[PDB]
């Protein structure tokens, strides 16, 4: 069973997938393969809650109907400065113009 | 016997027959039975509704007679109806229908009486008027539809519906699902 995620930090967002039965550490492993930072220099969040390295994604809340290809779930990412960690920061996307009245 | 080669031929013949001074309902029925149903020749009038049967007008017949095709789903059926003193012919194009004939009501409400009950096999053509009684037609099949060819002379928009339990009347005005092959909502 596959979940579909956007891993987000600052203005960088990653589109990737994983199995509901794969763990958070395993997810840092592939974030390592993309932005080249080891999992010990990474923090992963679901909204505001830091995620345990050994908890499986299904156990953190990412499941079949919560993280779908056409509507992926969001995973926050924070790196280590080199002493300790930065604050979790994610810039939102832009906003669409207000709906034309011709479309009700 | 005059054997209609096509459905159009049968329609050309009927127009001639109803142009004469006297209509012989034995000869009309015989010639309608004679036409061997060919779906390529009437498929355009075969339109189905999931919930009820459909009335599909084909020819309004120079004001002297109506020609319709009715389309019966699985389990679809008429109500107990009269024919407003007009001749009525029914020919099977596809499937079967069970005709159940009822006698008219005694005046105080009571369950009407089944006089007879018969099945109409394909290409068979029946005749009914108010002189023989009132009927109700249903498609008994659980798996296949029914398609029938109706001729009513004079044409009528009106007739009466009968509660089998009481016999009291409610008179209806009949819709048309299509006219000449075109949907009419």
């Amino acid at each position: 069973m596959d979940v579909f995620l956007m891993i987000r930090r600052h203005k960088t967002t990653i589109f990737t997938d994983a199995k509901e039965s794969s763990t958070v550490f395993e997810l840092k492993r592939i974030v390592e393969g993309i932005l080249k930072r080891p999992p010990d220099e990474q923090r992963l969040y679901k909204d505001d809650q830091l995620l345990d390295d050994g908890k499986t994604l299904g156990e953190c809340g990412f499941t079949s109907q919560t993280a779908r290809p056409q509507a992926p779930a969001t995973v926050g990412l924070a790196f280590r400065a080199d002493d300790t960690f930065e604050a979790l920061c994610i810039e939102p996307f832009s906003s669409p113009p207000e709906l034309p009245d011709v479309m009700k | 016997v005059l054997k209609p080669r096509t459905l159009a031929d049968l329609i050309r013949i009927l127009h001639q027959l109803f142009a004469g001074d006297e209509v012989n309902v034995e000869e009309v029925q015989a010639i309608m039975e004679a036409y061997e149903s060919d779906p390529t020749e009437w498929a355009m009038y075969a339109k189905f509704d999931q919930y009820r049967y459909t009335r599909n007008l084909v020819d309004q017949g120079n004001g002297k007679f109506n020609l319709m095709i009715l389309c019966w789903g699985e389990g679809h059926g008429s109500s107990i109806h009269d024919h407003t003193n007009s001749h009525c012919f029914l020919k099977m194009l596809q499937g079967n229908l069970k005709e159940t004939l009822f006698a008219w009501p005694d005046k105080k409400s009571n369950e009407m009486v089944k006089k007879s009950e018969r099945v109409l096999r394909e290409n068979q053509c029946a005749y009914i008027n108010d002189s023989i009684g009132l009927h109700r037609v249903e498609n008994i099949s659980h798996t296949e539809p029914a398609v029938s060819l109706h001729l009513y002379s004079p044409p009528f928009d009106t007739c009466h519906a009968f509660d089998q339990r009481t016999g009291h009347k409610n008179k209806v005005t009949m819709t048309f699902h299509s006219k000449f092959g075109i949907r009419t909502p």
Binding site: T12, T13, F15, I34, E91, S94, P100 | -
Partner: protein, 96 residues
Amino acid sequence: MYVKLISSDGHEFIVKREHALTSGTIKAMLSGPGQFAENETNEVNFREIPSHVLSKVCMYFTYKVRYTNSSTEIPEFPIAPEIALELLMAANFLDC
């Protein structure tokens, strides 16, 4: 295997390469002689597609890649009305 798509407002979107080739114009860019030489960075700037629609576009990418060979049922791709007009312009440009 991954390529970086950059929006007009500077949002970076890293998606799988074979996902991005869902776009006919991206496939034209990167499958022929426009392929990134290794001395280059795997970045494509879309300087007129804002981030709220570009993010939507990669959602379609994963959707299409996931359900193209599904054989019994697929969901509908949802489009909010506010982004519908802007999304339709990005799809016409991206040819997908």
